[PDB]
Symmetry: C2
Subunit: 302 residues, 2 copies
């Protein structure tokens, strides 16, 4: 047991150009996870968090994931999407979750959805929409950023089919470079542009929320296979730039801050993260394309 | 029951003029008989931080269901058998799990237990350094020894026994207070000057805030502010297109906005410029380091 545990939630920062009244923001509380038969495997101490969110005039959403102990399970979601009884069971359980606990809707956060299950995922989400909108509950989804349909691990996410059945699409537009890759910008503005351009040809613009990075990364250059970069917060990156007295430079092409330093063992490091200027540019491209919102992360200690 | 749970840790950013680091993993908590009440799956964390040539530390708290317990430390310190028992299972924890030492985070320590707290830490430094283990402590920031609710912390006595002092130099304005700077440079300088006169300079690490706060102005006593991260403050300012202003006296950024319900808000936080000023004052007074916060969700 530990009573210092951070509750992760995803929250919506509306495009300022767009604003008793219908709610303008949401908080997606992490997570509930699923069993292969479609049951909701766990429960949360969420009653206090739900009540507080409602009182603040913001919609509390339940996040539903395919998480296991070793991360997102490619197989557990597959067993659900291919058993019609199980995905009906999941649809009913999700409804039972939001009605009993008092959520205003959900956020489906299914990751590593296999490419063969792409139409089955859309169908599940259609079945979930029908059930939820009948009860007045909102349907939202977290998807990885897509620039085309040519990528295998992204092929399970049909943007046009998902955009047709969900109320809102949270596009997780980051991790173009990450802990298991070569150093580079986490969310380059060039790739965000391409992601938006691909999405606005498929989904109504008011359904689109651009999620910003949770993590920046610290890589050891001359990059080595097998090694994992350090996943650090944006403030952590600034904190490391101070300790090593490294100047914070800014890529013009990428609109992303970066710096390099040498540690107490001679090893050169390269850090890419997000600052105030880069985050401004992301709200700017949201406003440029008349999109719904920027989405971001908060940690609440309870 | 929850796969996404954020592990808080306090880590050390060395004064670059001194060119080793540590990470204090939160927490274990204490029973009134001096027992360690909980277990953590930390063996993977301990190993990963040892791997990066940084010292892992076990954070020991007086934490309960509803925050920090004055009562629990009041009963451990006053009873000699319980406090010797605590020293014992702290050492056993450090030795068996493979920690490089300890961080005492005992909060709301009563004024009457001042010297008894100093003695307990003395008794623990003995036992720890015999095994070659570091003793660190997290203390609330003092600018004097006068205000009675935090006079259970003898800065001079604590400084002579511990290896390093982590001064929590923030929350001069907090959730239950009037709007203002979380960690103004004026109160930081006063804290430092009070501390260095009584404590060796190389033992002093000044902690920076974890949260900034969002108050609805015309402030009404009884309500609570929204505790937000420093990035959350930036994000809130983009949403409401509020310009970020910087107080030169407090060396602390702030902004104001109107929400959708017509209420006016005042937000104080920490940015890049205010953070740099904190490292600058660390370097000015030749202190050990800045201490900050990491969040690891797994």
């Amino acid at each position: 047991s530990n009573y210092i545990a951070g509750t992760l939630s995803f929250y919506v920062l509306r495009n300022p150009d767009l604003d008793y009244a219908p709610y303008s923001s949401s908080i997606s509380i992490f997570e509930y996870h699923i069993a292969p038969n479609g049951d909701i495997a766990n429960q949360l101490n969420d009653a206090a968090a739900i009540e507080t969110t409602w009182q603040r005039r913001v919609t509390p959403l339940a996040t539903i994931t395919n998480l296991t102990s070793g991360g997102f399970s490619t197989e557990i979601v597959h067993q659900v999407l291919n058993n019609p009884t199980a995905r009906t069971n999941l649809v009913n359980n999700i409804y039972d979750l939001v009605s009993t606990r008092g959520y205003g809707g959900v956020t489906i956060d299914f990751e590593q959805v296999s490419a063969a299950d792409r139409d089955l995922f859309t169908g599940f989400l259609r079945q979930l929409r029908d059930r939820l909108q009948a009860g007045g509950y909102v349907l939202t989804i977290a998807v990885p950023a897509k620039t085309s349909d040519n990528i295998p691990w992204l092929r399970g996410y049909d943007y046009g089919g998902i955009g047709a059945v969900v109320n809102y699409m949270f596009i997780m537009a980051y991790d173009w470079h990450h802990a298991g890759s070569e150093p580079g910008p986490v969310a380059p503005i060039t790739e965000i542009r391409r992601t938006i351009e691909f999405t606005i040809a498929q989904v109504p613009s008011r359904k689109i929320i651009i999620g910003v990075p949770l993590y920046g990364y610290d890589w050891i250059i001359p990059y080595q296979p097998g090694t994992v970069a350090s996943a650090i917060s944006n403030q952590n990156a600034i904190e490391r730039a101070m300790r090593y007295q490294a100047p914070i430079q800014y890529s013009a092409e990428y609109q992303s801050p970066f710096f390099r330093y040498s540690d107490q063992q001679g090893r050169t490091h390269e850090v890419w993260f997000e600052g105030v200027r880069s985050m401004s540019r992301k709200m700017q491209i949201v406003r440029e394309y008349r999109l719904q919102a920027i989405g971001a992360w908060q940690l609440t200690l309870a």
